[model samples]
Target chain A: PRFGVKTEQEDVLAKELEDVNKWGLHVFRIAELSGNRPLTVIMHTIFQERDLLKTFKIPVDTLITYLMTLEDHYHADVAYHNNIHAADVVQSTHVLLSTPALEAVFTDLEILAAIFASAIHDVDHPGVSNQFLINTNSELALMYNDSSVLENHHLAVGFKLLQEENCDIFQNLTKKQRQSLRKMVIDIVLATDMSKHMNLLADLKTMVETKKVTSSGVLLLDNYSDRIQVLQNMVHCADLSNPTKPLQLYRQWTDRIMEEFFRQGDRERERGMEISPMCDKHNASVEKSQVGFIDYIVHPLWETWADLVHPDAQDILDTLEDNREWYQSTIP
Target chain B: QEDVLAKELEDVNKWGLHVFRIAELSGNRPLTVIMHTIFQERDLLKTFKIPVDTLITYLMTLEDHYHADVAYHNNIHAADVVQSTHVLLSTPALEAVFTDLEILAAIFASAIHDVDHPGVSNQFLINTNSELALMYNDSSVLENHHLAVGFKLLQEENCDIFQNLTKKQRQSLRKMVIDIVLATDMSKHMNLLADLKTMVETKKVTSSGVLLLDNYSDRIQVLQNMVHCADLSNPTKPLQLYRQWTDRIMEEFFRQGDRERERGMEISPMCDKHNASVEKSQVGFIDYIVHPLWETWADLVHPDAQDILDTLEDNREWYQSTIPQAH
Candidate 1:
């Protein structure tokens, strides 16, 4: 996907997969009216998805398809990193899922769940929380109630789309296998909603230090319950890694998210309404603000995950740096 | 075992990309129809609409949104809100006002209230000036949107549980639906509670030891209070359930609060410096957002809802106990 750049194609196959791979070719437009590139748009999506994908075991090819599907489903067709962000997140989940500790132990299903979650986690996110929708009674929020409406629907929608005849990844599953798959997948994807980000990350930290998967070399998820939490942790790690991704990618996500935010802001302003805090502002320097945000919110999350699975994340970190360096030279 | 619900989710998933969460936190709680069926009953009347067997069928095959990986977004909370609306519907004095018609409305309201909640609060919307806030012109925007959408989806034949209502009934139900949905906005909690208090101060009970409601003003007022209480009813529930909801709501609140800051604005209340101490923060939230509302509610119901109000105060003070360091 090209951030700030007009796109010619709707679907592009992933570099890693043959028939099973595809990523949406689109970027987060700075706003509905503006034809401009958001500094963080395209690259951030690639990094966040890539970083998140680290925690899972799914082949990157299938994961990219899932990300593209999520983008298409969610209207992430704008210029910023919507589809790319999904890609970055799924990649993060894949890398994080394979800690040397759990490398040999986890069941393939748990790994798959983590990767699936990263792909569709924010599939159709409206970029606002439940309260914003509720207070204003947004069509989406009204479409849902006051509860975690967007998060639930996003998860459901992701899985729902998978059932389409062409996207029938579940066709191979026995009935029981399908049930198990649904359960695991939902948990991981739901965990990625921004509202739950802190608690999810906290739990992961605690569970990591306390549960300390058995010293026995091999990981065995005897039951579905014990199995899914591991995947949950992996996805949470990916969601939190927005900051630590190579700064370049980090900026890309910030750009797209902010642009979406700005468009949201402009609409609010047009309505004679108060502008959303971060979404709208012509005077603000989107790039500098992103640098600070990366320093504060995004980077810290990645740092934690890197600590969790240090070695496997090296390449992911390298990708993050490449992105960051690009930002350093160009932003001024 | 079921395939239909799965098909339905495909429709919704196509409509909104999606997020997976909740039950996946521990991988223990799976979505169940018996669990969801508990909510199949309408909010006012304690009666079930679908055949018990059918409800079970729907529950068994429900398409869940969140996976175990995501922490808070899950099918379990969806089931819980359904359960909460069910229990709220059964409370004494609440039985009559909510006919099976209104019960269906309220329950359906509860079911989809947060059908796709993002886990953030209204104040965040105001601070961020989100498109959602912009779309509906900022008057209980989320609640308004929720009711409208819930009904719109009902335009789909099967999900329209209240298709049997008369045009007049539909109109009245729509008004009631607006009242109930708007009441869920915590942003309006203060006035809602204040109004409820004023109603109780007038101290008029029905001959049956119930609150009087001869007009839409009185009926809607009391009904609004009931649903509002139910919306924030997490605290009055058993500690286990209450804690779960508190966690979800707080997490949602904090994220919005954080998101607001990212946008260079002050965070929304209940999600601010006042809430830095999570449990301690709950006290004011309980007292202001919870207690006053329930206190007036107690006044309205008098002998009818003494127990529920008592639970409210108890819950409020319970949080107050943590006040020492919670804030």
Candidate 2:
């Protein structure tokens, strides 16, 4: 409830986050090192780098406390969508912003919104898909009328946390700034739904093929629509970035997600409901499913996203192809 | 994306950068990209007393002889080795040792190293009793053709990059270029690596920490090893780029394998795609050829290449990890 609970570990956290753009960022190490303060350390480290605390008049101690509180709100019991996953997405979003082509493209406000949205996009997730909630007539489904049910719940919960006095990280922002930030954050989080993937990728592909560049070779995104479109696709790409990670880490993610999926499917069967295809573990060909997921979803999306950022995401695409081929070779 | 590629091409002189990407960015203008880096870095146009326009014309004509469809021996590979040579000469300890003439010959040698290559290996050409092999009598057949065609192109109007040099200067440059390019024959690999290993073991660095180049053989040995390492540097690259290059060279090797298999001849060690375990072969390559060569080269230029050696080990482990886990 107070400011400046800083420790010697905070400086180490700050130094490591300086390389937050690298592919090899050790999120698990961060969780171990920072103890109860992974989100606080990450956000504080990023804010200090951009000097956003001074620029926006946000109290540093209050902001750190607020991020810690936000991290706590994420359900640790969930397998795939827990606090560590939130922290990983936040790190990936930060890396995407650091891409050379996109470096000077966003305002500090948009960047802040991006980092915040990534941190809270799956907050309080129940480790089940929205379709599962709708089929069961769950409280969250009825609350949002089954349209982006979980996403709307996540945004509402995140904004509610910021309203507490000790967690009011945005308290220093004026009315106009707060409204705009809230709107951008909501837009980004809502678009993270799987249903929006195709539309987002289409927009990215169209934008790239017809892209207009300044004489200096920087693509000119002159309007709000174009900028938000980029932000929308950026968060979506980060959300799906697991397949593009190093082979070892990528396999671990698959194990975690498969465990979560089958658990949900088992619950569906207990309630006498049809199980999702991914949940049919007994019948599922793990390798084939992975290849399909990468071919149909991960590869096409990342490939287009790479074209949008050009040269920046080539490494990501390379890892994805290697991982995909890895899964391909594993199929019986 | 185009602009980003353009930017990387503009900054091509940086060490450990990607050459295949630049080749894609430059379209067919890889020669211009290579020549631009050399001429700008060494101030070749002013230093060598050459006209910029004519030099560009000559380099472009030289680039034209390189077939883009060739898997490994193409303009992109040529540009890659040229860039590698550029990085080697610019080693912090060795930067001041080379004369402008030697720099020009190294660049020229790299540019023409595989010009007019037929995309088949020397063994393939010999087995087919091809015209090139018959013409050269089984002695560095591909190397001889590359040199002959490259020099013949220099006879065309406005296509001689070295035309501005004095007659004596031109003859000396020609001799040095031929010597270096001929050394690219695979037979010289052991011949090259043995001398390099000996040099590194003796701690043959000069007072400045560069390889001792006080004499002619020492000088040519270093130059020969520089090009050889460049050609075999796939595993030494960053992992993704390493894999891409691995994929390319493997494809080239397998294409030759397919030809040999169809002819009812023996499949080479790592060439039979159906029987080949890519992971196993990569490990063998790194263990036997690539690591030994790069280890010696890294020794010759210590501390600077520590990260590069780390990447080679990392890539080796990536392949090492790829072997299927037992059920």
Candidate 3:
């Protein structure tokens, strides 16, 4: 009740529609323009573009409340993994789904699933690593039995909110389609854990090695494994896409994540625990660290991803390489 | 190489002494270089009742554990701290309170405070879920590891430097050594400084102007502060000598930062080489950490540390003029 009453008498989606499709869009800026309703704005623009509301006979009021309520579920205090991160990832999924090579591979329903999965993948996050939870014997770790605890929590909490009468955007889909969407979303969100990084990257490399292409040279995805793998890694790339973003957004992401990391380190030290690497600000080097990250993890993954989408993601890869070089030069 | 080492050792007690050079000249054997100096200078083998042959063997084995490849926190830094602890205890106003055993513990603590250092921060160890972190339950992870290895090395048949001591005497020596080395952990900086501040507030001293450290708590607190100040004394060294330390520490910090970056993690402070200007890094470190600790030490022994204070001020002003609001 406190949040639903806004300063604006009407929705702000019309202003957002003009800029929502931009590749370099920042959701925080969109939230400011939309009077702190970025979720509503994005959902409105997306549903309108695909004519999903009309096709499913969904009411505009129902869609508005569902998205606004979903946005409210995200904790704002989290530095790097909050509602804004969700919105940014959603927009990234939107753009990635529109990649010229990727555009034809997914059905309308699959596209809907991609966007939905990104929007809720990190819902109700507690702003600490899964290892931190395990080491501290946190309740969530016990709940999930030490296996992808954060991811499991995110998935459970997100689907629980969707069970609210007004919140299920797929309410009008066929039972079979809804089941597929739910399964696809669950699989993609679970694959987002850093532990899955190696497997995901390996699968991607294998796909590139034996990749099938239509006569038109678009990637062929006739199998469920191939389709889900691409989409799973798609969202994965979007979540870590900060390093590949334009320099300004990239720097902001770096700073935000560092703040969150340092807070965790502070807690560890207070409990007489050892501080985590990169979390110890006293001994960290931003420039050199970025260079190492790009070279070791981000670069390898993105290089494969760029090859997967070919020329579609070339610009982003170029920017990523540019960022890496900047960090290399800054090595003190 | 031996001739160069001899020349550097000749400058070991000079105010403008260059230890990085000494470490290089001695083929990364600064521990051997300085330990012999201290042993001979104070005639410590006789004072602490360590058999000369046993002491030599014990120290050489301890020196072998320090990984030479680490850019900082290596044998050279250890030797430097040992030298610093020696100088601090011998300061005129503070010389009277220390017993032969206390001095032995102080020197031993400094020599082995960071043995087997991995060249990364403790937080890095905990974050990586390192074996040592788990072994110590994350508390004083690196410091505890140092003590464990140091004590383990002492267990060798011919390396028992304290073999002559009775069990009761060795127990107190171990207690003192553990307290002082654990206190060197930077995480305990604030607590250690608080106790030092209380001592300063009370201005508690003996008639000879030496701080009264008669009780166990007061004595260890003083010894802890002594080694801590020694551990961080780079800023108080002569200008040319201090600059070399700054470079060495920065190199070490950036190297660790590079490792974290490779792990796809965030960079910590002083690790981001681009932003950590050589001047601002030292100045901020001095103003926030080094200066505060040294000022208290200076408060305890006024004229004895006036030269160190003057050099610190000169270093701070030198950076200010050259760097101009470095960020």
- Candidate with top lDDT is 3
TM-score, candidate number 2 = 0.49
Model 2 ranges off by over 4 Å: A1-18, B1-327
Identify the runs in model 3 with alpha carbons over 4 angstroms from their true place: A1-332, B1-16
Sorting all predicted structures by lDDT, with the top scorer first, yields 3, 2, 1
TM-score of 3: 0.50
Q: What pairs collide in candidate 2? A: none
Among all windows of 10 consecutive residues in model 3 chain A, the one with the lowest summed lDDT is A1-10
* Per-residue lDDT of B191 in model 1: 79
Tens-place lDDT digits, model 3, residues B213-300:
6688888888999999999999889888887788889999999888888998788888977667877788889998998898888888
The 0-to-1 C-alpha lDDT of every candidate, in the order given, reads: 0.55, 0.79, 0.80
Residue-level lDDT of model 2, residues B97-207, one tens digit each, is 777888888888888888999778887886665666544444577887787777777767877667679877876777677778878898778878888888878755667
- Per residue, candidate 1 scores C-alpha lDDT tens digits across A11-110 of 3312222211122122222222112222123322443444433433333444334434545665545544355556556655555554565665565555
Native contacts retained, all candidates in order? 0.16, 0.00, 0.00
Best by DockQ: 1
Per-residue CA lDDT of candidate 2, range A147-257, in tens? 577887787678777767778888888877876787788789888999888887888899999887666556679888888888988999888998998888688788888
The CAPRI class of candidate 3 is: incorrect
For residues B1-327, what per-residue lDDT tens digits would candidate 1 score against the true structure?
A: 245444333322121111122233323433454244334322221243444444434333332322333335445554455555566556665547645666656655555465445566555564454666544434466666655644566544344444445667765666677667777777777777777777777755566655456776876676666767666666665555566667766666666677777878767766664457766666766765666666666666556556666666676677667555535
- The better candidate by lDDT, 1 or 2, is 2
